[PDB]
Design a binder for this molecule. Structure first.
Ligand code: Y8N
Ligand code: GDP
Ligand code: MG
Length: 169
């Protein structure tokens, strides 16, 4: 029947994982959202003329490496790797998130998009060119977003869907 895309949103505390997912799926911006609340979000969408189902895990809570957690992340088809453009530590953590994706999927060829969120803010601390260079070194797209204004948000998620489609060929 209808194709379902299983996406996983990862990244450090406070980068906007929840805000991005709730904006895309529930059409509003949360000014704050408890960092322990983890949910799968679902919506039917049309992407490049294809009607499909998005099933998006907004990861939260604690870092942990039980076999069950590994296996749950293994079911993800594509990963949105989010940092905030005013949080250098969140950008420095991206390497770690990519390595865990590669470990559980046992592949360097996993659909992934690098997302620099909070683009609406002044006084960024992560240079866009440094982020582009990191994405270039991984061979993945890089997209700047604002969960607050929704600039780039749908583009970022739809780009990940397009990468999953491509990987299926
Ligand atoms: C504020 C709470 C929050 O939103 N968090 C995001 C997720 C839930 N957390 C998380 N944290 C880390 O690393 C945190 C940190 C800082 C302390 C030391 N440690 C290492 C680095 F320094 C950064 N890492 C996470 C993950 F790697 C993953 C994850 C991603 C892909 C993957 F295939 C697997 S398999 C598996 N098990 C895990 C785990 N854990 C991953 C995840 C995810 F939810 F599973 F996707 C979360 C990670 C806690 C805080 C930051
Ligand atoms: N200005 C601005 N604030 C944001 C944006 N995305 C998230 N936030 C805020 O940043 C804080 C952390 O966001 P949250 O989604 O909880 O981050 P998470 O821990 O990664 O899930 C919250 O106060 C959000 O309202 C954004 O794009 N712009
Ligand atoms: Mg959250």
């Amino acid at each position: 029947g209808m194709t379902e895309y299983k996406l996983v949103v990862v990244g450090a505390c406070g980068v906007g994982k929840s805000a991005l997912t709730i904006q895309l799926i529930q059409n509003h911006f949360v000014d704050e959202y408890d960092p322990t609340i983890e949910d799968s979000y679902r919506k039917q969408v049309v992407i490049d003329g294809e009607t499909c189902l998005l099933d998006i895990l907004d990861t939260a809570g604690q870092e942990e490496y039980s076999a069950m957690r590994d296996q749950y992340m293994r079911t993800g088809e594509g990963f949105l790797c989010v940092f905030a453009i005013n949080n250098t530590k969140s950008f420095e953590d991206i390497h770690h998130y990519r390595e865990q994706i590669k470990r559980v999927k046992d592949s360097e060829d996993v659909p992934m998009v690098l997302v620099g969120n909070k683009s609406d803010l002044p006084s960024r601390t992560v240079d866009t060119k440094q982020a582009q260079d990191l994405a270039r070194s991984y061979g993945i797209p890089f997209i700047e977003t604002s969960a607050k204004t929704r600039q780039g948000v749908d583009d970022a998620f739809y780009t990940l869907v397009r990468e999953i489609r491509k990987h299926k060929e």
